[PDB]
RNA sequence: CCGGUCCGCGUACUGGACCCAGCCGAGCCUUUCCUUCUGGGUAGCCAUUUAUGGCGAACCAGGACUUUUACUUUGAAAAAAUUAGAGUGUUCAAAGCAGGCCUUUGCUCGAAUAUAUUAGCAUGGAAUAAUAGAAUAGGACGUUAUGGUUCU
């Protein structure tokens, strides 16, 4: 069955950004996933993104402008000690100057500068650059 | 999809985005409880109720004009079946298959199908157990099963 | 955008239905999808010639851009092309390459005819695909008249007519011919008449 | 990319894709740069001086290099109602 | 005043209940004004010179309201020049609870803050009904609802729906734009 | 097509679409006021209906149901509500 | 923002930012409050009889209750030796925890600090993932609501 919602919907960002398309439609919606566009959002990987009630778990068009090289999830949501992030961060990211891992916190959810900025720590959630 | 066989197919309902009633709806929400009353006296399930309702009243969904699902009036009215439906239906076409078991001994394929209804039974039983919908001692047995039913 | 003068004119809508441009091929691909107006009851397929139009006219004003004429290449392996390549080569200054395109002649520098055009103008992406196949191995634009069943791979700007009609090719030549030449002052406005005819470009079986 | 002095210690700032905004590497042949001539109001096309676009070679691959510029040269005026958003 | 079913009603409120007393001269709408009763008018101002007069009708009254409130609005517009006029319920909204909150009764979704904000959003525009509704998330970082109404009886609110954005960012402070996909046009 | 208006499709293209394959799934289905020859009384009948639905004056049948919409009996007129 | 000085990008130091924006907080209001309980204690209410009528939150200190977790921050704890690591001319070094001062009837820096990690303890937070609740109501509030039956 569906397992992961967000997995389900970074891959389909991911290949409607390496075949160049400029949106994709992503189903099903949920808090998780649109906490996790606005980071993207933030950052600038991504731009304007639209939620659509369809009184269900709902669907999401995401507009991508060709800056987003790949956003991922990790599944399981590992527990991450503070100390364990800089390792996290070696693995995954491609440089130490561009790029977050993007965590869920108590503190919310947040990318890894952020994280190290409030001095809080959570589950890991997923990585983008 | 499909738990007991290869199938792919997704044909359902399809629910409409207004969950109002519509402009020419005039029954008021108690005809509808009496209509209800009145069919589900008769031996319908709560699925043959709905589906009379929408070809032959007009009732679009019971929920949106009553305010709850047709099983729900049942219950608050103590006409709710002691077997769920769907449950019924189970233990029904299970009771049908060993019937005519008995008699075709070498109907193999039957002997397969009884099976997959069997384990559909005990997985839907197991799940209204937790939901205290049947009683903890509550188990199904082939062979007092066609007293429930028949 | 683009002064009014511009705009499919009656004159020429009147051509392009008599050369039988408008009939597209029967099976349309996906990425010709936006250009067909609207499918005939036989089978074949309406082209929207306003959207043609365009398209000749965005045409033309990437080959003006070109500085040498010479530099741009006019390319037609079918015969019902051969005769409209070569009197468009000769009005525009233009290179054409009517018949057999060699292999090679664009990333083999040792072979006889071995041009480096900044640009290259097809017929038929069909017919004519080992001309657009080298130009995708040096950085070579192509622009290509495309039916309904012609492939758009490495096609940048795609005029859409019928590949198929005698008519059809010699119009679409002499109305690109005419333009660039507009655009370049030679026709003195839009509105005077060329003095040539799209007769001419015509190609003409050995009986006559 | 530049030191914390400031200076521009890079080298060949590349091109960029006008359809998908990808980077169009220095050995990518199947790559092209459309020039567009401007036209002034007499009709006449103006001498040096174009509107230029980019396109890297996976675009052109795929085919969609010609949906691309129907969309790209609509939204700068050079077409009028060819090219539909909505499809 | 005994309209009016909140102690100490202001002079807008004792208006509004005196036209109230009036509209039930007429015997056609007589048979169902002496139940009706309201809790309070909120009037704010919108742009164009016009001003929005809210009023508020115990929930559990809500559709009693409904059976008339397209004749009523339409005379009590008449009665009110310059007013543009809106029949919303008093719902209660219950805050989320905090993790050591002591334990109460389990809160109904009736009234958690999304289903209150969403039931506002449907008393605004009552004669229409809605088929969609919309969140855009711009870049800014801001968020814009759209909430997409039927063509069928618009022309009860065709003219407004400015009123009801103003009226919807005033109580909630979320911006929000009203559409009719689906008009002659 | 790599750019494409996805929050607004043509009507056209999304009407072609499976029903539950539109941006949001609506049936296609309806309901209907049906005129029996024989008599006039309003009997709301669905478009789909699997019920042999007869009205109350004459135990008439009005429909018979199949795999998709009912079938109307002769001299009987439909209008959709 | 005098970069004088400190000790020549120097530029550390730091009089002076006037803070652009940004970043880490804290409260208050938006339908959003530990239900409390006993004082302090009573100050302002409802001051018509007050700190002689009825503002216990007007902040503490002494009581009464509490859906269960998982997770993550911080703290105490996890012996010394070993490891990392600050200092120290064992003639260098491996080491050691020594040592240094004008030459001493004596003066005098030290012998740091990190890491431990599953389990237990205290703690901030409440995203994520569970869990319980109001359905034959045997449901919640009445702070001073009216009785009755028991029990301390
Ligand atoms: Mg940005
Ligand atoms: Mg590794
Ligand atoms: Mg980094
Ligand atoms: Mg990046
Ligand atoms: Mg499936
Ligand atoms: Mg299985
Ligand atoms: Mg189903
Ligand atoms: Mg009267
Ligand atoms: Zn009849």
Known sequence: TRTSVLADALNAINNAEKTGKRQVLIRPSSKVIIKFLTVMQKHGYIGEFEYIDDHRSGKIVVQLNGRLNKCGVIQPRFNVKINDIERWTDNLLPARQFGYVILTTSAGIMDHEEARRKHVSGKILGFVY | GRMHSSGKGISSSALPYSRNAPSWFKLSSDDVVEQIIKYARKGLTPSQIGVILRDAHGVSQAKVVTGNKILRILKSNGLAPEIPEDLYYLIKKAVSVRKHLEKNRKDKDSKFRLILIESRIHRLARYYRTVAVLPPNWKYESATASALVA | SLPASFDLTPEDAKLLLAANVHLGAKNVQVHNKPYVYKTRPDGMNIINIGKTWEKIVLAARIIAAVP????????????????????????????????????????????????????????????????????????????????????????????????????????????????????????????????????????????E | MENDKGQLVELYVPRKCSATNRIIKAKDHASVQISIAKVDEDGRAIAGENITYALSGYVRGRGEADDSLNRLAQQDGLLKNVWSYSR | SSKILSENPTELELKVAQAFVDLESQADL????????????????????????????????????????????????????????????????????????????????????????????????????????????????????????????????????????????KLTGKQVVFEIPGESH | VLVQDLLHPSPATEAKQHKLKTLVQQPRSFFMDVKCQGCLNITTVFSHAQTAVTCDSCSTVLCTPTGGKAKLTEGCSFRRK
């Open chain 3, 68 to 207: 040498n004429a010479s530099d741009v290449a006019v390319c037609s392996s079918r015969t019902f092309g051969q005769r409209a390549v070569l009197k468009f080569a000769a009005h525009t200054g233009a290179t054409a390459i009517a018949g057999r395109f060699t292999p090679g002649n664009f990333t083999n520098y040792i072979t006889r005819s071995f041009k480096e055009p900044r640009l290259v103008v097809v017929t038929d992406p069909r017919t004519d695909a080992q001309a657009i196949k080298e130009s995708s191995y040096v950085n070579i634009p192509v622009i290509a008249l495309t039916d309904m069943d012609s492939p758009s791979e490495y096609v940048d700007v795609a005029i859409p007519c019928n590949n198929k009609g005698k008519h059809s090719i010699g119009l679409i030549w002499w109305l690109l011919a005419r333009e660039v030449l507009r655009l370049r002052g030679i026709i003195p406005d839009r509105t005077t008449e060329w003095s040539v005819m799209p007769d001419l470009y015509f190609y003409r079986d050995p009986e």
């Open chain 5, 30 to 169: 007589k048979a169902e004004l002496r139940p009706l009763q309201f809790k309070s008018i909120k009037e704010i101002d919108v742009n164009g010179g016009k001003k929005a007069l809210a009023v508020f009708v115990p929930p559990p009254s809500l559709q009693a309201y409904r059976k008339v409130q397209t004749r009523l609005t339409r005379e009590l517009e008449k009665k009110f020049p310059d007013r543009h006029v809106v029949f919303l319920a008093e719902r209660r909204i219950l805050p989320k609870p905090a993790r050591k909150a002591r334990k109460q009764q389990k809160r109904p979704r009736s009234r958690t803050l999304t289903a209150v904000h969403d039931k506002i959003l449907e008393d605004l525009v009552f004669p229409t009904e809605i088929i969609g509704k919309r969140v855009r998330y711009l870049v800014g970082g801001n968020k814009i609802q759209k909430v997409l109404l039927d063509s069928k009886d618009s022309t009860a609110v065709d003219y407004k729906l400015d009123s009801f954005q103003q009226l919807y960012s």
